[PDB]
Amino acid sequence: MNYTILKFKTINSKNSILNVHQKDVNCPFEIKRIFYIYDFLDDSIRGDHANLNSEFIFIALNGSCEILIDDGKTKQKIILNNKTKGLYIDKMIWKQMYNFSKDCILLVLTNTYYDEKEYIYDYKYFCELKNNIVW
Amino acid sequence: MNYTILKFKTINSKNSILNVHQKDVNCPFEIKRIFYIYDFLDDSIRGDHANLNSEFIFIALNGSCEILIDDGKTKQKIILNNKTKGLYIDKMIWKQMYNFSKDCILLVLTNTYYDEKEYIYDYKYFCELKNNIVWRGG
Numbered sequence: 001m002n003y004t005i006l007k008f009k010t011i012n013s014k015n016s017i018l019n020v021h022q023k024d025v026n027c028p029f030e031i032k033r034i035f036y037i038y039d040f041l042d043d044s045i046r047g048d049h050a051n052l053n054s055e056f057i058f059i060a061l062n063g064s065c066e067i068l069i070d071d072g073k074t075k076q077k078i079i080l081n082n083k084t085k086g087l088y089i090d091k092m093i094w095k096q097m098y099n100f101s102k103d104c105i106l107l108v109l110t111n112t113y114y115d116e117k118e119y120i121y122d123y124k125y126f127c128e129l130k131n132n133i134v135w
Numbered sequence: 136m137n138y139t140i141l142k143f144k145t146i147n148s149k150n151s152i153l154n155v156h157q158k159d160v161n162c163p164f165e166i167k168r169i170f171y172i173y174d175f176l177d178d179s180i181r182g183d184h185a186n187l188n189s190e191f192i193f194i195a196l197n198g199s200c201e202i203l204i205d206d207g208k209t210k211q212k213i214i215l216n217n218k219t220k221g222l223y224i225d226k227m228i229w230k231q232m233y234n235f236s237k238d239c240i241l242l243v244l245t246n247t248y249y250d251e252k253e254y255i256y257d258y259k260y261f262c263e264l265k266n267n268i269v270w271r272g273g
């Protein structure tokens with residue numbers, strides 16, 4: 001599956017630490033949209049979809065969570081809990097996020113404007129799209 | 136001086152809160168780069184420059200800090216301390232940030248790639264370039 005764990009370069013100066021993201025700097029794509037997710041309750045789950053076009057980098061900026069990614073062929077669990085690590089996934093990877101700490105802040109970077117129409121919410125279709133050897 | 140304290144529209148769902156930023160959603164520019172600053176020790180200070188092209192939104196995702204902004208003629212101090220608000224500033228505004236809490240995480244959105252040639256680190260010449268721009272009609 002087309003995922004990587006990225007290790008960010010930081011700039012340690014002025015008694016603090018700076019992490020930069022842009023095309024070719026701790027990010028393989030061109031950024032167009034950012035969002036962050038916070039104030040999680042005990043059984044919060046996010047995701048349950050794949051996206052046709054958007055690539056993602058997920059970064060836990062505070063606290064931590066889990067993510068299960070799935071390409072139709074294999075699955076992986078990933079822990080995010082570190083400001084110098086990110087999970088990069090290509091488009092057409094199903095994901096769910098859960099087991100959020102109380103204090104988790106999740107930052108997501110993507111290369112597309114939000115488009116409800118690029119979403120795949122039906123898992124069987126997703127798996128047909130990833131595996132069906134006719135097409 | 137051109138700045139705005141934004142109140143963000145949040146999406147409250149799935150037992151959590153989502154804040155989205157892109158052109159015309161909680162941000163007036165096209166995003167091209169993001170950065171965040173953290174692990175501040177007591178006396179830490181950031182900024183001390185102006186930028187010729189870039190606009191910015193500053194958000195305290197966690198904790199709090201104070202920002203001073205300066206148009207060459209006046210200055211203004213603002214506290215950043217929660218996730219539903221940020222400070223938009225236009226280009227060619229000088230800024231300095233200080234009084235960071237130990238747990239402060241500062242997130243910044245901007246509309247450009249990083250460019251050393253866009254920085255003005257000398258306040259005196261900041262005021263001259265800005266006074267000239269203002270003089271021109273800007």
Ligand SMILES: Cc1cn([C@H]2C[C@H](O)[C@@H](COP(=O)(O)OP(=O)(O)O)O2)c(=O)[nH]c1=O
Nearest residue numbers: 033035045046047048114146148149153155
């Ligand atoms: C990610 C995102 C979501 N939303 C809205 C639409 C969705 O109904 C809701 C949550 O998005 P969605 O991606 O469906 O949930 P998750 O973040 O768990 O994957 O917020 C936007 O308006 N813009 C966005 O960029």
Ligand SMILES: Cc1cn([C@H]2C[C@H](O)[C@@H](COP(=O)(O)OP(=O)(O)O)O2)c(=O)[nH]c1=O
Nearest residue numbers: 011013014018020170180181182183184249
């Ligand atoms: C913001 C930023 C800084 N840097 C480098 C250049 C600077 O010497 C240093 C700090 O940036 P600078 O903007 O000069 O300081 P501050 O963050 O306090 O305003 O890190 C980058 O390489 N890319 C970036 O996007």
